[PDB]
């Protein structure tokens with residue numbers, strides 16, 4: 139109930155929320171059906187429009203006007219945004235040359251530059267260049283301030299997940315808004331755009347910027363705007379809030395525009411009808427900046443121009459129907475469109491089986507435009523699994539397509555030429571970032587980055603301590619003139635052991651064999667030096683990774699590679715080796731095909747054994763340092779140590795071997811050497827975080843050898859590729875992957891063909907950030923370079939996306 143008999147007199151867009159049943163006057167009151175009787179009359183005036191003209195200059199103040207051109211309007215804070223231009227001979231902000239803001243220039247009483255976030259729905263990155271001729275104000279922000287060529291949204295590339303990610307710094311799986319539509323089985327409740335459930339606070343996890351500010355005593359404007367409130371009125375309300383007295387005035391503000399998303403769904407991303415919405419946005423920016431000039435705040439406020447996602451070409455005719463694949467289409471519930479989520483229609487049908495649904499959906503049609511996954515097998519870069527609201531079965535839809543249950547769902551619910559939601563590495567889904575103000579750099583371009591990183595910077599711009607989030611604090615310091623946050627490396631938790639030769643061969647009983655009884659201080663003091671780490675500076679280029687948890691591990695040195703060998707998981711956590719541009723690929727000699735050799739530095743009881751792989755008919759083994767890249771016949775024997783061995787499914791060995799025999803050499807040729815770090819990952823509970831020993835769900839049969847869920851590699855070289863990887867004086871370049879360790883290649887529909895046609899395509903789909911690997915392993919990389927730590931953090935967040 140709302141007794142809406144109170145009055146908004148003197149309260150229009152008040153900042154406190156008055157509780158039920160007393161009526162409200164805040165910018166959300168419509169959406170809650172709770173406004174006071176006179177809200178429209180007093181708070182949403184429209185008389186005479188939004189601009190001053192010549193003949194209003196110095197008028198008599200009349201309070202019914204939407205905005206004023208009277209002499210007292212600056213005092214009152216309520217002039218039309220163009221008042222000084224028309225009535226006092228001033229220029230529009232956009233017509234002024236830009237001049238560096240080297241220091242804030244704020245009026246008396248401003249404790250800190252305010253932040254204004256100007257958010258635009260569906261603003262595709264390529265609009266900044268392709269629309270620049272009709273967007274002069276936005277183009278001046280971009281060229282004068284700090285801009286990226288694009289910003290990467292989160293998955294799914296929908297509005298609510300992305301706007302709440304911007305506000306919290308968290309992945310959707312962590313903040314809880316995993317879609318525009320959701321079912322929560324614990325609550326037994328549904329979230330939708332139409333209805334009242336989406337208001338309940340229980341959907342909304344984490345801590346958004348406006349709460350963070352409030353708890354730390356920085357005042358915030360209200361971020362949400364009811365769709366009927368026109369843009370011009372949104373802008374004037376922000377400016378009115380900016381003339382409030384010092385003790386009452388917010389320091390952070392948001393504007394939001396439904397455009398150009400709205401028009402983009404109807405007309406497609408580059409439909410001729412899209413020029414007009416882009417003009418309109420620019421005009422709105424122009425009003426804000428002119429309004430800031432009038433208040434003397436245009437060299438004081440930091441402004442962020444930011445989008446939630448892009449837009450792609452999508453039509454009704456490009457729909458796949460689950461009814462053309464499944465027999466029992468009526469026993470499922472599908473969340474449809476640019477992504478697919480499937481669960482059982484009824485909780486009381488135990489003739490529901492995901493395995494059979496998946497299999498009926500896997501590589502069934504030659505051109506099939508979606509690919510089914512169990513959520514834990516989705517590429518780890520999407521971070522889209524660890525929430526009860528994400529259904530176990532997921533369909534990743536190709537760009538330009540939709541998935542639906544049956545054809546009647548499409549025509550009886552074409553009407554649209556654009557949509558969004560696809561994989562967040564797709565170029566059409568990329569969106570924008572520009573920062574302009576005293577705290578941002580002047581005429582600076584920065585590389586593309588992820589929207590999960592912005593919360594930290596918005597906290598820095600306001601002097602706030604960010605709540606715990608998924609950004610890497612410091613990774614965006616190169617956007618800022620000052621207010622940098624100066625991070626320190628985490629402390630290493632476990633120190634390694636450095637074992638020497640401690641065991642005789644006969645103490646081992648591993649069931650392994652090797653034809654190595656083939657037999658001098660010349661070549662012998664020399665191989666001893668190799669076991670104490672004489673070549674370690676060639677192979678470990680950025681220092682040893684640090685172990686950030688408690689555990690027991692050994693550093694092992696070899697001529698061609700170095701490892702950190704876990705006595706608990708019985709395999710390396712990491713294996714590091716450098717492959718120069720001149721290196722040669724060899725084969726495994728015929729006598730050495732099944733060679734595995736005990737390591738006399740490591741005890742029997744902390745070693746794998748070959749009997750277990752013999753008895754496990756499902757499981758085979760591979761090596762982390764590849765024998766194919768040994769520097770000499772004699773060095774090759776090191777590559778067959780039991781301490782370099784890791785469990786691999788025969789199907790995964792096809793992928794692994796091709797990566798080791800062909801691609802590493804190819805990368806070395808192309809990048810002028812590469813340093814490689816490889817190893818395993820255990821993430822059985824799909825939370826993106828390393829599993830502890832007591833959480834392992836699968837072992838090589840009859841043994842304590844744990845089976846990895848994934849295998850990673852980090853591949854590093856010199857950004858200036860005229861220098862070799864191992865003698866690089868400047869910035870680095872990296873790419874990485876986290877491959878799923880799976881017993882089949884069902885993910886790859888061409889996998890019966892030669893590896894040269896499908897392996898690299900799988901690896902690109904499972905591209906990753908070094909940071910992603912950090913979370914999954916509890917390791918910390920690049921500890922000893924000559925680069926600044928901020929730069930290294932930027933490198934660790936880089937994602938190689940293989941879009942052109």
Ligand SMILES: *[C@@H]1O[C@H](CO)[C@@H](O[C@@H]2O[C@H](CO)[C@@H](O[C@@H]3O[C@H](CO[C@H]4O[C@H](CO[C@H]5O[C@H](CO)[C@@H](O)[C@H](O)[C@@H]5O)[C@@H](O)[C@H](O[C@H]5O[C@H](CO)[C@@H](O)[C@H](O)[C@@H]5O[C@H]5O[C@H](CO)[C@@H](O)[C@H](O)[C@@H]5O)[C@@H]4O)[C@@H](O)[C@H](O[C@H]4O[C@H](CO)[C@@H](O)[C@H](O)[C@@H]4O[C@H]4O[C@H](CO)[C@@H](O)[C@H](O)[C@@H]4O)[C@@H]3O)[C@H](O)[C@H]2NC(C)=O)[C@H](O)[C@H]1NC(C)=O
Pocket residue numbers: 308309311312313314340341342343344521524525526605606607608825826827913
């Ligand atoms: C991305 O960044 C995020 C954020 O940093 C990372 O997410 C964090 O990861 C932590 C590890 O997974 C996790 O720690 C948990 O916390 C449990 C308690 O947490 C509740 O409180 C949180 C804080 O809110 C308060 O914030 C400020 C302080 O900062 C206060 O002033 C306020 O008063 C606030 O209340 C809260 O965020 C959290 O919310 C989740 O659940 C809500 C409702 O269900 C949602 O609204 C919201 O979206 C959150 O949902 C996500 O996170 C939960 C996991 O918490 C997840 O299940 C959902 O799917 C969703 O993804 C909580 O309400 C604490 O109980 C945990 O401790 C157990 O484990 C330890 C291990 O050391 C045990 O030793 C300990 O005994 C304990 O075990 C007991 O429970 C076991 C399992 O139930 C049981 O078997 C056992 O026998 C024991 O009884 C643990 O510390 C953080 O909560 C989490 N934060 C967020 C926001 O997600 C994330 O990892 C990053 N991602 C990557 C890839 O890096």
Ligand SMILES: O=C(CCc1ccc(OC(F)(F)F)cc1)N1C[C@@H]2CN(C(=O)c3ccc4[nH]nnc4c3)C[C@H]2C1
Pocket residue numbers: 255257259297298301302304305318331347361362363364392393394396399
């Ligand atoms: O008022 C706000 C956000 C305030 C905000 C701003 C910045 C912000 O970010 C930051 F915090 F960083 F500032 C957070 C919240 N909203 C009201 C809107 C209603 N909506 C849709 O009807 C809609 C729109 C596009 C679609 N395409 N397909 N379906 C769609 C459905 C989306 C909404 C969000």
Ligand SMILES: [Ca+2]
Pocket residue numbers: 820821822823824825826827828829
């Ligand atoms: Ca885990």
Ligand SMILES: [Zn+2]
Pocket residue numbers: 259260296297298399446447
């Ligand atoms: Zn949107």
Ligand SMILES: [Zn+2]
Pocket residue numbers: 260297399400403558
């Ligand atoms: Zn949209």
